[model samples]
Target: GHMELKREEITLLKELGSGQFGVVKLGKWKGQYDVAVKMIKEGSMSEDEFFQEAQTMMKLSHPKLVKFYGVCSKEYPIYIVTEYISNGCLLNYLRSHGKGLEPSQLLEMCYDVCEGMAFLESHQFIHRDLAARNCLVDRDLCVKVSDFGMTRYVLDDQYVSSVGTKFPVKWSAPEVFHYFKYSSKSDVWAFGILMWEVFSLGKMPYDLYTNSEVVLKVSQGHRLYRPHLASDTIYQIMYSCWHELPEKRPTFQQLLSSIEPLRE
Candidate 1:
């Protein structure tokens, strides 16, 4: 379901960002605060796909999740309005500062990320694109999971087969590249690589290997190792995320529980 939007309803401020199917603009709605408006290209995706995307986002509501302001699908081009995070993405931060954050700071950021994932897990939502680029960090370093374009709902006791261009092969788990199904466990695997990105200061995972090489390695059960800079506790947590078997990987609740003590 898309909302109706008049030209006068939104005052476009600037082009905040743009992706393959959409462009995000910093805009202001009459009688409302500033927002990030995501405008999808006309005829980019089928109506059913757009509706599913909208519905999935509608089901999400957590402090660590970006706030959905509104949606406009009635018009030829679809638009999704969401709260704007000022600090930009985690990738940018890591690129500028490197992986030199204090252990406490990394843990704090990780905590926020886990909280967001936990929320999605509770709703059986799997963020197929879990990575630093998809996570936005606010001024206070609060992490918010963004970019749910590839998100999918996991029904009770059911898992879906994996399919995609394999853009994130380095971050993928062995099962994913081996044609195994995707579930919350695949998400866990991605999260572990995200942690690696944080610790490596946003460097590409398996930088020395090509996409095919990385995929082959993962299929052969090769897992990424914690960088020398990472602390023991953080490394352990990341290791748990890359457990060989998806079922053996910790649930979001378990991951959250493991990090709870560090938050104190």
Candidate 2:
């Protein structure tokens, strides 16, 4: 398909959710296809950068990824349309349903995310922001990664300083916090936090610490405590992603293989 989506083909319906980025609506595209339409708030993001990213997303097709349908960028507020997962995000799912879920189910959630991330890594794409909140869950309780790289296109660093912060600070690695650097390894660091989120039933990463406190603690060599639900073996896997040096962290492909055997 071409890059641009026909604005007429998209009919925005009920509002699904709203976030700092924009409002998402349960919409229909081309009169029938179910979709989640993200209506980008005016001046909230870098239009030029988002346009470029839309082009990249247009070709990305993967089962574990939230499928990109198309973009309606020819209007005042651009709309990025994608596949709608009925379960919404993984974070909310864990918080609401974690009580009834088995240990195997929690492990599967992490594995699904790792599979999506492995595909991105193989394609040389870095998921700048990888968190449970950014991933969606389907009706089958399957996970699909979303908001893959929108953080980089966020206004600018100055805006972050002025408007508190938009960065995923608690999920960030030392290099990301200190040098403003990002890579697959940094994403791996975030994945560890995502795994923790699953096992902890969606508890905040640094539960008692402020954003500033987390930065200081992380910089001074403190890592998140292991969730009680995660056994020593599982905790070891999570800890592997938090190595001080980025070069020491395992790639997504390796992480995927490592966790597959643990699947029960």
Candidate 3:
């Protein structure tokens, strides 16, 4: 578990991306192997927040969660290192090939995601953001949830800004939109939307609808129609995640139990 990384050992490669968390890059670690390095903006995050997320990642070890290899330089251009998954984000992968997948494969992907959420739940952690875009699939066809910045202030500041901000409105639960309350049940709601993505082949949840549009509709008790591609049973389980009360929603354990049977 000693993943402490030194500055000199990382050779930065091409830019991987830039998010509210900061920029990510493909980098060479220890001058030999490749890894993804997320450089959290110094001013945007508090040291305690960084440390907490780091500590949380350190304690978590699950196949469905992205591996946090280590960190380098706790300050400017701070590097958070992890294993590289060649296939990329779940959204792009679904768009590229989701429809081609057999029902069993899709169910397995959802099952793996459920397992990750279950782990987080058991650890008393809230994902807050659970969506296809935040999930990653590797070349080995395994799905791993991408865990990123969770500094309360920064996330709140950026959360309601725009869909472009990855604020995840269409996936949020009613309480999350109204009171900004969060819990693993909130995560379950988002997982339902992610299932929509899987069945819809990665289409935007409320296509062409503004953030306000979804805010009003969801707050008013409306929910998404079943994905045209999803079977009745798939939609049934997905629907359970959007119950009006968080307690009414299925826990990850219940979710796995329901979904696993679909494979047979």
Best by lDDT: 2
Clashing pairs in 2: none
Error of 1 at 205 (Å): 0.8
lDDT of 3 by residue, 1-264 (tens): 375778888889898766448777898988788798888777777778777888788787899998988888545867899888778788889989887887677777888889988887776666767888788888877899887663122121123321222366788888777766664577789999998888888898889789999899887888888988778989999999998788688888889878876774
* lDDT on C-alpha atoms for all candidate structures: 0.77, 0.82, 0.78
TM-score of each: 0.91, 0.90, 0.88
Instruction: Assess candidate 1 and give its TM-score to the true structure.
Output: 0.91
Which candidate achieves the best TM-score against the true structure? 1
Q: Could you tell me which 10 consecutive residues in candidate 2 have the lowest summed lDDT?
A: 153-162
Give candidate 2 misplaced runs (Cα > 4 Å).
Answer: 148-166
Q: Lowest-lDDT window of 10 residues in candidate 3?
A: 151-160
- In candidate 3, position 66 carries an lDDT of 88
Relative to the unseen true structure, what is the C-alpha lDDT of residue 21 in candidate 1, on a scale of 0 to 100?
63
Q: Candidate 2 vs candidate 3: which has greater lDDT?
A: 2
lDDT of 1 by residue, 1-264 (tens): 243455557777989877436788888877587888888877777788777777777778789988886776667557787888887778898787555577677777778888888888888877777888888888777888884576767753467877653447676667666765676677888888988888777888888899888877776767787876678888999988987777788988889989889873
